[PDB]
Symmetry: D2
Subunit: 239 residues, 4 copies
Amino acid sequence: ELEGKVAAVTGAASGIGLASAEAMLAAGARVVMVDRDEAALKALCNKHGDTVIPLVVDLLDPEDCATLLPRVLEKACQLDILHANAGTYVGGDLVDADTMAIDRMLNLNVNVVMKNVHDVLPHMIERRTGDIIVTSSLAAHFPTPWEPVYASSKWAINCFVQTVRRQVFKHGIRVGSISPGPVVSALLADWPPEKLKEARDSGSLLEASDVAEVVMFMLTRPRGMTIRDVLMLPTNFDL
Amino acid sequence: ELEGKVAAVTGAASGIGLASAEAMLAAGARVVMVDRDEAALKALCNKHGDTVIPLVVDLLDPEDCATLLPRVLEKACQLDILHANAGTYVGGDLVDADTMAIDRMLNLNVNVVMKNVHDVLPHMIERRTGDIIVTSSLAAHFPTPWEPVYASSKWAINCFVQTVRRQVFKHGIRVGSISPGPVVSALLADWPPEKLKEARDSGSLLEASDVAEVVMFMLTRPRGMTIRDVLMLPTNFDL
Amino acid sequence: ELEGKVAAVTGAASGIGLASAEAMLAAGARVVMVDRDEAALKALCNKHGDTVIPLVVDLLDPEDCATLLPRVLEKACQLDILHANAGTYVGGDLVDADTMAIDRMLNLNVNVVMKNVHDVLPHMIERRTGDIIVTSSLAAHFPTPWEPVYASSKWAINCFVQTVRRQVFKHGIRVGSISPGPVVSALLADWPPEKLKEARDSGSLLEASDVAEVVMFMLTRPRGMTIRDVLMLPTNFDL
Amino acid sequence: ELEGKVAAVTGAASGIGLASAEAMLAAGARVVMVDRDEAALKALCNKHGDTVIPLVVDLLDPEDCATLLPRVLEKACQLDILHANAGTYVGGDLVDADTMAIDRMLNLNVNVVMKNVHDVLPHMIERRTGDIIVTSSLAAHFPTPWEPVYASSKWAINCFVQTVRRQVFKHGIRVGSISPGPVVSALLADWPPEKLKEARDSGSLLEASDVAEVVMFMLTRPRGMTIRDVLMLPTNFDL
Ligand SMILES: OC[C@@H](O)[C@@H](O)[C@H](O)[C@@H](O)CO
Ligand SMILES: OC[C@@H](O)[C@@H](O)[C@H](O)[C@@H](O)CO
Ligand SMILES: OC[C@@H](O)[C@@H](O)[C@H](O)[C@@H](O)CO
Ligand SMILES: OC[C@@H](O)[C@@H](O)[C@H](O)[C@@H](O)CO
């Protein structure tokens, strides 16, 4: 079980963040779902009763990112887990892409992730026990030619995770990430035609509910042990 | 459960291979323990009844490595899993080390691992379903200055695993590895004084029984999904 | 020689960008020095005569980053080389650092670098011949525990460079980077006390004039060949 | 110039080792060419006069690898440079390849390289000044799916080089490697049909004489600076 522990999930309104939030709830926890889409959250706040706490944060406003931390402790307190799942996608060639989404992407996939971790760590250091999981990707361990802006952001995540945990583990904290291949998501529309055609694998891609069990296996682990990364991909995906 | 599946484990006579073999047996499987030490195996063949099949193979004789495959099918058949856990250690500076152990190490940590995989794959391609797990290390993802010969071998393993699975997954096969930090083992005597002192962490290092559960989680996984690597280390180990 | 070719250098007002700009000038080229400090540039515009073109760009305003490209072609045209040397530093623990510099850093070390490349590439694709060099770091190939925010940005650069060149080389373009260890720079004040003490190596660290010769060796290279990266560090630096 | 320095080159009888040996000779040095093919060496010993010293070493006999070091000091002494260029190739799928060449390859591409370095280092530590260059490959920085056995060996080389230099640089020694893409070589016959077709690039591949100049640039470098690696590939090669 997850006893009476509290967890926060960015981008929880949909996709992996959604699957991760629902799986934590099952194990017995209050979960604070964070995303920009309140209308999407609303439907979750009721058919999930009481234990689902919504928190609307653009997360792309420096003022909003800082709202995050205290608001969690305000709304529920008892923070023991953070899951920075918030992420986007930009694929194809570098030209033919706008300067805009780029900025927005790296800031959400890198800047936001770091700031969130930076802002929630003081709590865990006083309290001791802390747990942090970042949503990485298979692109963190491969130079995928068709997503230069996306893979690079995940390479930054790879470094950041293993390096930051080296300066925090003395305070009873665990840090890790999940590096999944392609997964069913609205983000699949943001792909280029390079591959995708690959993602037509009758090896039904990866289901977002499957990675959540890995997240649980990472959380539900002897405190003495830390799982820093997990490389998972659809068996019938060529990479 | 592991139904009536059969598995083979190199270096199963002790350490991680030993923990891995025992955990498979629990899930319900015949396991072929492979190692050079028959006297060590003997004690396992009886107090583990019937389901423990011994196979004495030096594994450092080209003639013996080839004995491996048919002998498994001879002794029990029904091979669905291979675990290349056989490995050794060489630490310290490069000078002050003998040319000999080196050769012996790389051959066992690289040459033997590959040959074993090469020799058991034909079976799985005809049969379809196959599963392969290689025992890697945290050194596969770090340039540890105090074990030049050991880390490099694990970097080769990192490449080999993810690259070989790209040319086999079309035949219903899963390939992956486990990259654990330091673990209680007779190999701990082979360490230099560089760190080790680190391994005095009252964060009781890593227990070999804990990684075995990760191996099960890798095996006991939807066939559609493949876990390629798992980074685990003692929480109180600085790396 | 660099014939009548033109080059642009970000952060050219000081440090590696300064050394790189001066070395190009020697080989025979007009160089557009780009930086926020006009007063620093001014002194360079006169004691370097005619061939030094200044361009004041904050580079941390989306409106200013887009000013870059046309202004180069406006001020001098004939662009054949881009050098994205602009970068900053953030070291120490993650806590004890402000959310602000972080954002500013990743945006300059990642977002700005990409946008600059994105905006200058169309020219080279029409013209054919193009050359791009990014200033990376030794941290691009190591998880330095004491600079989590800086190393991660360089890991992104490592991916970005080798991956972007795979989708441009068909148009007669070369892309690469330089990954130097610590070098004498005003950025040395931004270091933590972790190491630095190392940088007291009577092995006089690395001189910024030495890396510039590597840049020339990268540029001054058979067009048929592309140098993608160069790992250089002070001989007496432990990493 | 290379003053009156002496250098040793493994696999110098042909290919990159051949180009490297000839380029050193030009700069002014005695060079000991090492290879299994005496008949190939013979033709070099005469039309290259006096400064070319042959040394026939199988290099795949543990007894022969140890012959190496003293014999160099026997034949010429004054060793200041070692170049471990000796290497082979194995491509295609893992099945369809023999256990034999594999063993032979990893031993020559990994075991032999290490042993050679291990055996020549004591000299340089007493003498102080030393220089070591290992012939790596682009495969050291990519998981090439069509050469599992070759790339993995180069990943080991990548670790070995940067990690070994960390425990030797205090004795006035420089260590590095060259990571070139595909190059014209008799080893081109050992390729699979996967790509090769790529190597039909009218971007004339890479010429072995071009990498030698990089080697010189690595050697001919301020002692205070060490070039640890150089990533070079044919501009019109997709990787
Ligand atoms: O939804 C994005 C996906 O989860 C990510 O993993 C990459 O797109 C994939 O790895 C391709 O490299
Ligand atoms: O028993 C060996 C250990 O399991 C291995 O993981 C390394 O020694 C460790 O990672 C140090 O880098
Ligand atoms: O000025 C910054 C320096 O050039 C950079 O290279 C890193 O600080 C160094 O590598 C430490 O890892
Ligand atoms: O002759 C071998 C070649 O030099 C090597 O570099 C690889 O074959 C190439 O990189 C393919 O990955």
